[PDB]
A paper describes a structure:
Here, we present a high-resolution application of SPA to electron crystallography data, using cryo-EM movies of the prokaryotic, cyclic-nucleotide modulated potassium channel MloK1. Each of the four MloK1 monomers forming the pore has a transmembrane domain (TMD), a voltage sensor domain (VSD), and a soluble cyclic-nucleotide binding domain (CNBD), which lies in the intracellular side. The total molecular weight of the tetramer is 160 kDa. Furthermore, we identified different conformations of MloK1 tetramers within the disordered 2D crystals by means of single-particle classification.
Although the 2D crystal images processed did not diffract beyond 10 Å, we improved the resolution of the MloK1 3D map to 4.0 Å. The overall resolution of the map improved from 4.5 to 4.0 Å using our single-particle approach. The map's resolution is better in the xy membrane plane than it is along the z axis. The refined map contains nine full MloK1 tetramers. Even though the missing cone effect is still present, and images of tilted samples are generally of lower quality than of non-tilted samples, the application of SPA algorithms to the MloK1 dataset ameliorated the overall resolution by accounting for local variations in the tilt geometries along the distorted 2D crystals, thus offering a higher diversity of views for the 3D reconstruction. Our highest resolution structure, derived from the consensus map, is in general agreement with our previously published model. However, we here show that the previously determined structure was an average of several coexisting conformations. The procedure allows retrieving high-resolution information from disordered and non-flat 2D crystals, as illustrated by the 4 Å consensus model presented.
Numbering used by the authors:
A (entry chain D), B (entry chain C), C (entry chain B), D (entry chain A): 1 to 355
The structure:
Amino acid sequence: MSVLPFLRIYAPLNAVLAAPGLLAVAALTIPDMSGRSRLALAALLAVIWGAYLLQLAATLLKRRAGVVRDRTPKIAIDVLAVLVPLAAFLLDGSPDWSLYCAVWLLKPLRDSTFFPVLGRVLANEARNLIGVTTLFGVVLFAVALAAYVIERDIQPEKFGSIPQAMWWAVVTLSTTGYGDTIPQSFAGRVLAGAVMMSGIGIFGLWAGILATGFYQEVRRGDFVRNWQLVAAVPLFQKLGPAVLVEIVRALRARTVPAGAVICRIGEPGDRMFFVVEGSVSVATPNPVELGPGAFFGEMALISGEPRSATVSAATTVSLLSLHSADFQMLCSSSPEIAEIFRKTALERRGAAASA
Amino acid sequence: MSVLPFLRIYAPLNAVLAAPGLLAVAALTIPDMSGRSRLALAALLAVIWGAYLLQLAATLLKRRAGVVRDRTPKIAIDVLAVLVPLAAFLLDGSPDWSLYCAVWLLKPLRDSTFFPVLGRVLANEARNLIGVTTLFGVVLFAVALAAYVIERDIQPEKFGSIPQAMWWAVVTLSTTGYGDTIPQSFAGRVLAGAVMMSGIGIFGLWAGILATGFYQEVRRGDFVRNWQLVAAVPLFQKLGPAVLVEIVRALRARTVPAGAVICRIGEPGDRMFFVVEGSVSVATPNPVELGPGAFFGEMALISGEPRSATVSAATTVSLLSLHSADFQMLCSSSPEIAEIFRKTALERRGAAASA
Amino acid sequence: MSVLPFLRIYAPLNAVLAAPGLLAVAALTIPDMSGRSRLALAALLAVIWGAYLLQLAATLLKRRAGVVRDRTPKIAIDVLAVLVPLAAFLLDGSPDWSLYCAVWLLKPLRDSTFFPVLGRVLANEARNLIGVTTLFGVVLFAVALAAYVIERDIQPEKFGSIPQAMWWAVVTLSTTGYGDTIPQSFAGRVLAGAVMMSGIGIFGLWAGILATGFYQEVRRGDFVRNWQLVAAVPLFQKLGPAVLVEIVRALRARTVPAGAVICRIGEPGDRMFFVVEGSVSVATPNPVELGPGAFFGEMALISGEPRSATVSAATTVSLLSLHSADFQMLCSSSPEIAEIFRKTALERRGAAASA
Amino acid sequence: MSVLPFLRIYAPLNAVLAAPGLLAVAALTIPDMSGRSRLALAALLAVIWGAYLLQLAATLLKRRAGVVRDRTPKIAIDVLAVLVPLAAFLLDGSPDWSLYCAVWLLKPLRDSTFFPVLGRVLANEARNLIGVTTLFGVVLFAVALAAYVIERDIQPEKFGSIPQAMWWAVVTLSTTGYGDTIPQSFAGRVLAGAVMMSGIGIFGLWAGILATGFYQEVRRGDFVRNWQLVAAVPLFQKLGPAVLVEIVRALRARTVPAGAVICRIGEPGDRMFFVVEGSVSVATPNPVELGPGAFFGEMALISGEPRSATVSAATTVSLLSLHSADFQMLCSSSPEIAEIFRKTALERRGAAASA
Ligand SMILES: [K+]
Ligand SMILES: [K+]
């Protein structure tokens, strides 16, 4: 609610091409298909093959920034991106060679930041996942066994064994309920009353494990990435130690590209920003072009009024952002700073039109 | 638990009429229907058509409050509300013209506050939704492919391709489980054990994304809307800076209309209010009619007793509200204020009967 | 994790008898049933009828504590508990009179505390439930209409109308997936990809609405019920104002009945209690029988050792409870109090054996 | 995200053998099976039988640490682990004796820490589970009855009774939706609109009950287990009282075994540790082998640089761990401590190569 995400977060074309590339599989997988487009998309594999391959050797030019680096992850797919289709072409002479479109699926995961953020937390909380998983194994066979006791008599063909009744556990416990084999007697139907009750409590915890410290990590990602963009601000020599931990939870940083709009005039004032690197276009008769280490919006937050200038991203600006409360928090946190923002709430009134 | 929502939160009849209006579709959509009510409800479309149309030109009288406004949203439907049925009437001569009852569906969304509250947060957290969505695309085809490996042999008609096995992914991953095509072999049945386990972890995060900062925003909505109704209170010149941020999270403001009841006598005392605009009917022999900027309930919270007066909303009062703890928080937060509320807990005892 | 709930929380037999009473329905509802038990359980209705009826007039003796009371809820069922079966007996001569076992279902809800706790919060947050519910009505027909566009041609008998396709929305949107009518074409199958994605986000919020402030209320229930049992403690004249709000979130009060066990000797020490009313049996050679306004467990928490005495509930004690951290919080919160608890950690060592 | 879990958290072979042991059931449960492996796995039961039996008498040697102990749980299965198969062998002469592989299922639960953590909280919050469970019983039969009113006429064979319509409640309310018996009329189909809406709100609370204070307990488990490893640190005589409660929520302790790696050189610096018992291998020309009560990582966190030494677990070290923010919290929490960590950020620069 308090950020301007721009400049193509889904930027690199290395990620883009797996999307059209993998859909090239399906037409090959289908009978009664004309040979025209059958082979036309096979080229598109060769294109993406050639495309990454063109990228590839430029990636294997890893003399860029070569001081100390850990690029086993980022290289691990680019290598196999072209080898696996290549060796696939010859040994697998039949058209099944295309079934190695399991390979590009890591290419999104190659440059998928937020995926290492995922795997980071599992190596702390998997202590719980296992005891829950074992417990899920407890509750599975503890329950899957209870049915073989009963309907093996009149349902041999469906419940004439245990693992057939392990199927009907997770189908019945994991909220799904296909509808292939269902009991007939009374007692087997009684048992389900706790099953759904159980699995919705298990997953009521187990899925809870993920979002639990995940949110800690994503809420943490807004700090580790943003203890930077702190010292750059010329004013923040006076902020107390504990003051910052209160604040940085809310301040998210994103970048706007050149030419784009930051805050349009007349739209309702609801937030203020801290420019820290780049430049803007404060649309006034004398443009107050504020560069690295500036801010604007207090003119709108103190009064609660529309925007006083169409600020456009004249360049690629690394932006911060902040709504009222957490700035009202700051104005409440210290009178020493509200003074200059009161002054600035008068200076920028005349300094917007003047120089 | 601590608010009196009244005066028709679902007020404007512009929103009301889409409900009966859209149900007018269904009778037209059905064979063997008598022509009587077939056309009778077609009028009701003309009524709502005419009704908004009567409203429409009064809306196009947008000279009201015409200083600086952004009414592209609020107008965008009212225009199409009547044009699209109109042009539908002529070109689409067959009864299918009624299928443009897809149009009024925005009319609730026209004046649906809390809908902009929804879209506000997606433009900050969609950084995550995409990486999760791609990851959902990873896990889909990573898994949907695993089955074509197997049952293409003995299930051509069901699993004789990939996208047929992409159907059976989300059906199987998204908790649903229709029951159209299910495996027969063992290994294809093993794979599902992680699928439901997976999708309930994916959605265990992904649905978590929504409620995560949504609640931040709704809990924030109780501040941005309620840093107002602060300075109006004559007593709040003494409240410290950090005192308020602690409080306003709990104080929600709503309005009661004239004539309605606010707190009835004898009911158990559980909360106190701050009147800030309007007037009441404190039902006493001398009615202590307290207008803008008052409060009552401390007589019940300090003692823990029933209500001392049937307070009725004599006018349309913009109300606040507060339970004990967060007022016990205030009484604990400062002795300076509990003095006057102790005094007021004696003054209003005699001042309730007297003037 | 930090409380001893005892003395029959499911106490009153008024609540108990609906459980056996309603199961008396089913045998009447079944063909080929012998008349023996058919009428035998009809008596049990007369028993519960007579049982509450015996209770009833004693309830209508509402001269007990008759000062100011609001007993429209608690009476509203007891009246109908016996009238509705009575009038059912005569006018409904056929056995369908038993179908008024819809009536006792409120009797649990009669004395179901925690049910008013439920309805309390809906009257503050239903502002959201409606906009979400309308939004659910938006997303229903916005989506349910998209299918009639398509399969009306080759699925008249299943999708030959709109509301048939409204059925297949919530079945498909609300995680359920029966398996009655499913598409055949491609495009109708594409649409479901966002449906489950959508409904799991809708309910990802909407069910979130309930648990959101519900937990605020239940976490609040541990305060409003426990600002009592504060002043009774002889030591709590020194506790600062803000000290208490930190504490009472954790302190839950429950009651133990006479004769029961409170802490058995030798079990691992993990918590301490505050006795405020009643008496105990501190099993020592000289029983240190501590009555209203006492505590014990610091002997185990400071050392981290087993229990030093088999404390048994000699009488019905209104108990509090507290684990280490929130007491380590207290020991950390003030040196003034840890002194007496250090002294008490020596006094009760010798005073346990002596008098 | 901030811990190094190592040394075989799933360690004891008592837990390990139930996994292969129980799968020995299934081959016996199947017709047309060759007798070779039929009896081969029956030995494996005898192995695990003998294996625990070998363990058993060594467990019944409970003269180890025999001062005051409560080992009814840990013994309760080991006894039955071998008796129940034994008596099963003789009385149950037919192969059904193997159906007492319901017995080993507690053996994981024997040494499943985190399982007592589960049952601990239910004895405080089951006050809610019951009122919700009764409420679930309210909503079940309140709704399951509504359908017998309707389709008993034209669906006798499916809805010719009540409990058949109690089946179709939880199937329909608990998110599952098998697809055995579904209505035909309109009104019975209307009713489901609130059912899924209801059950997803019920479980929206009820599953919420579990994760609610569960997370309190697991977040508490990181304190009760970690008020230890506090006094061992030589520096923590100066930490204020309230300072610790802020910190210990984040500090989790785990153990690394001998020979393993702790932080490899060159990997990105993201965390620091407190060694409290054991020894390391700080891979430098002069190995700065720091034993019980040390720390490292400030060299990387103050600068934000890679690791300055391949620290390997030379012995079994009981480790703590800490990311930046909560250490930046500490550096912000006190200048008195950042001094020595500034000094240490210079001492260990030269003391890493020197002695
Ligand atoms: K389902
Ligand atoms: K199904």
